[PDB]
Design an enzyme around this catalytic site. Structure first.
Site, PDB file in Angstrom:
ATOM      1  CE  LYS A 110      -1.425   3.753   2.541  1.00 12.03           C
ATOM      2  NZ  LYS A 110      -1.414   2.725   3.593  1.00 12.03           N
ATOM      3  CB  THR A 111       2.215   1.294   7.016  1.00 12.04           C
ATOM      4  OG1 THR A 111       0.818   1.210   7.274  1.00 12.04           O
ATOM      5  CG2 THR A 111       2.887   2.196   8.031  1.00 12.04           C
ATOM      6  N   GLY A 112       2.430  -0.378   4.498  1.00 17.49           N
ATOM      7  CA  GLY A 112       1.918  -1.458   3.692  1.00 17.49           C
ATOM      8  C   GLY A 112       2.290  -2.797   4.281  1.00 17.49           C
ATOM      9  CB  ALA A 113       0.906  -5.547   5.565  1.00 21.34           C
ATOM     10  CB  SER A 121      -0.978   0.013   1.175  1.00 24.29           C
ATOM     11  OG  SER A 121      -2.060  -0.832   1.033  1.00 24.29           O
ATOM     12  CD  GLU A 166      -4.095  -2.643  -3.089  1.00 19.89           C
ATOM     13  OE1 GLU A 166      -4.052  -3.859  -2.710  1.00 19.89           O
ATOM     14  OE2 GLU A 166      -3.291  -1.787  -2.619  1.00 19.89           O
ATOM     15  CB  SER A 201      -4.674   0.988   3.895  1.00 21.99           C
ATOM     16  OG  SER A 201      -3.546   0.745   3.110  1.00 21.99           O
TER      17      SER A 201
HETATM   18  O1  LIG Z   1      11.112   3.308  25.666  1.00 27.20           O
HETATM   19  C1  LIG Z   1      12.572   3.162  25.789  1.00 27.20           C
HETATM   20  C2  LIG Z   1      13.025   2.085  24.828  1.00 27.20           C
HETATM   21  O2  LIG Z   1      12.912   2.604  23.542  1.00 27.20           O
HETATM   22  C3  LIG Z   1      13.329   1.809  22.449  1.00 27.20           C
HETATM   23  O3  LIG Z   1      12.519   0.556  22.421  1.00 27.20           O
HETATM   24  C4  LIG Z   1      11.595   0.461  21.374  1.00 27.20           C
HETATM   25  C5  LIG Z   1      12.057  -0.695  20.507  1.00 27.20           C
HETATM   26  O4  LIG Z   1      13.262  -0.322  19.865  1.00 27.20           O
HETATM   27  C6  LIG Z   1      10.988  -1.099  19.504  1.00 27.20           C
HETATM   28  O5  LIG Z   1      11.368  -2.316  18.905  1.00 27.20           O
HETATM   29  C7  LIG Z   1       9.635  -1.300  20.195  1.00 27.20           C
HETATM   30  O6  LIG Z   1       8.684  -1.582  19.179  1.00 27.20           O
HETATM   31  C8  LIG Z   1       7.391  -1.889  19.720  1.00 27.20           C
HETATM   32  C9  LIG Z   1       6.348  -1.865  18.605  1.00 27.20           C
HETATM   33  C10 LIG Z   1       6.004  -0.434  18.190  1.00 27.20           C
HETATM   34  C11 LIG Z   1       5.032  -0.339  16.993  1.00 27.20           C
HETATM   35  C12 LIG Z   1       5.030   1.023  16.241  1.00 27.20           C
HETATM   36  C13 LIG Z   1       6.041   1.041  15.044  1.00 27.20           C
HETATM   37  C14 LIG Z   1       5.407   1.220  13.655  1.00 27.20           C
HETATM   38  C15 LIG Z   1       6.240   0.695  12.436  1.00 27.20           C
HETATM   39  C16 LIG Z   1       5.558   0.564  11.061  1.00 27.20           C
HETATM   40  C17 LIG Z   1       4.069   0.471  11.229  1.00 27.20           C
HETATM   41  C18 LIG Z   1       3.643  -0.197  12.505  1.00 27.20           C
HETATM   42  C19 LIG Z   1       3.982   0.658  13.716  1.00 27.20           C
HETATM   43  O7  LIG Z   1       9.278  -0.134  20.935  1.00 27.20           O
HETATM   44  C20 LIG Z   1      10.225   0.084  21.984  1.00 27.20           C
HETATM   45  C21 LIG Z   1       9.608   1.195  22.855  1.00 27.20           C
HETATM   46  O8  LIG Z   1       8.310   0.830  23.332  1.00 27.20           O
HETATM   47  C22 LIG Z   1      14.795   1.474  22.595  1.00 27.20           C
HETATM   48  O9  LIG Z   1      15.089   0.468  21.643  1.00 27.20           O
HETATM   49  C23 LIG Z   1      15.101   0.918  24.006  1.00 27.20           C
HETATM   50  O10 LIG Z   1      16.520   0.800  24.171  1.00 27.20           O
HETATM   51  C24 LIG Z   1      14.508   1.811  25.097  1.00 27.20           C
HETATM   52  O11 LIG Z   1      14.663   1.182  26.361  1.00 27.20           O
END
Ligand SMILES: OC[C@H]1O[C@H](O[C@H]2[C@H](O)[C@@H](O)[C@H](OCCCCCCC3CCCCC3)O[C@@H]2CO)[C@H](O)[C@@H](O)[C@@H]1O
Ligand SMILES: OC[C@H]1O[C@H](O[C@H]2[C@H](O)[C@@H](O)[C@H](OCCCCCCC3CCCCC3)O[C@@H]2CO)[C@H](O)[C@@H](O)[C@@H]1O
Length: 265
Positions: free
Chosen positions: A209-212, A45, A141, A105
């Site tokens: 914008k994201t996609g899967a 997307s 799509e 999307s």
């Molecule tokens: O809050 C502090 C923390 O912040 C980060 O941690 C991040 C980590 O690196 C990431 O892997 C995770 O993902 C969790 C999932 C998040 C989803 C949103 C991202 C987007 C990407 C594309 C679309 C979907 C959503 O979050 C944590 C924070 O909570 C640091 O890596 C860690 O050292 C620190 O201690």
């Protein structure tokens, strides 16, 4: 967190998949981080930003209007049409269709718009007109999400997509009002924007914008920066990983964490 390149590598290790990534200054086009930047990844997307760039180019030329109301039929709809399924009786404007495609999307909205630009072939031709000789759309799509291993259909490269986004947003190929509209649609993403904000430190701008897709395909095209400024384009694609959606999200976010912690490069 690791330096961005080292975090990208760790994400490949952990996912068993390929990651592709560019980080680019929006204003100048300086490339900051590059990893598998010339390798192909399914757009999924994320193509809808380019699609609506092509729509806006027609609007600027007087060949389209964002006001124009399109009537469509139920038999036209494809899988995942949260906005368009609600407007069988009254239709949607072209601008509403772009908003539904980018911010929700909505797949049927995307297909209706794709037809107005001449289908996958017409959108590919638009890409060639703006000097992107690599990105290609082949299907509609939702087949464009199939992500068959080794299939070049419906792919971009991180470098191509970053350069194309910058061209659409900033190069004056689009009118000032159209550049502003494309950016606002990305600001308004409802699929991932609020979730990203909920995990960003205070002061970080996001538009996206994201996609899967199948076989682990996942991607994001985004604007990110501190001081509430869209300072950099960040493009991340994943492919050919068996990992859960949650872990793919977490790995993309971990790359974002590395960028945030090492922003001055
Ligand atoms: O809050 C502090 C923390 O912040 C980060 O941690 C991040 C980590 O690196 C990431 O892997 C995770 O993902 C969790 C999932 C998040 C989803 C949103 C991202 C987007 C990407 C594309 C679309 C979907 C959503 O979050 C944590 C924070 O909570 C640091 O890596 C860690 O050292 C620190 O201690
Ligand atoms: O020192 C920098 C910061 O480090 C932490 O912030 C963490 C944050 O608590 C966490 O939630 C996030 O996860 C990462 C979320 C990333 C969301 C953007 C991802 C997108 C955006 C662009 C396209 C690719 C991915 O990481 C940062 C950096 O460690 C501290 O919490 C915060 O107080 C501090 O200001």
């Amino acid at each position: 967190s690791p330096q961005p390149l080292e975090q990208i590598k760790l994400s490949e290790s952990q996912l068993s998949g390929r990651v592709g990534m560019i980080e680019m200054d929006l204003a100048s086009g300086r490339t900051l981080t590059a990893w598998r930047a010339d390798e192909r990844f399914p757009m999924m997307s994320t193509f809808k930003v380019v699609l609506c760039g092509a729509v806006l180019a027609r609007v600027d030329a007087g060949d389209e209007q964002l006001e124009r109301k399109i009537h469509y039929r139920q038999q036209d709809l494809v899988d995942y049409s949260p906005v368009s399924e609600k407007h069988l009786a009254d239709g949607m404007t072209v601008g509403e269709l772009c908003a539904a495609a980018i911010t929700m999307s909505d797949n049927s909205a995307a297909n209706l718009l794709l037809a107005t630009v001449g289908g996958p072939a017409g959108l590919t031709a638009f890409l060639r007109q703006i000097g992107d000789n690599v990105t290609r759309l082949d299907r509609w799509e939702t087949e464009l999400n199939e992500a068959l291993p080794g299939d070049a259909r419906d792919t971009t490269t991180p470098a191509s997509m970053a350069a194309t986004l910058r061209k659409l947003l900033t190069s004056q190929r689009l009118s000032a009002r159209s550049q502003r509209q494309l950016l606002q649609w990305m600001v308004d993403d409802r699929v991932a924007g609020p979730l990203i904000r909920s995990v960003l430190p205070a002061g970080w701008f996001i538009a996206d914008k994201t996609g899967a897709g199948e076989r682990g395909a996942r991607g994001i095209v985004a604007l990110l920066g501190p001081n509430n400024k869209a300072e950099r384009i960040v493009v991340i694609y994943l492919r050919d990983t068996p990992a859960s959606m949650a872990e793919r999200n977490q790995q993309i976010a971990g790359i974002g964490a590395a960028l945030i912690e090492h922003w001055q490069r």
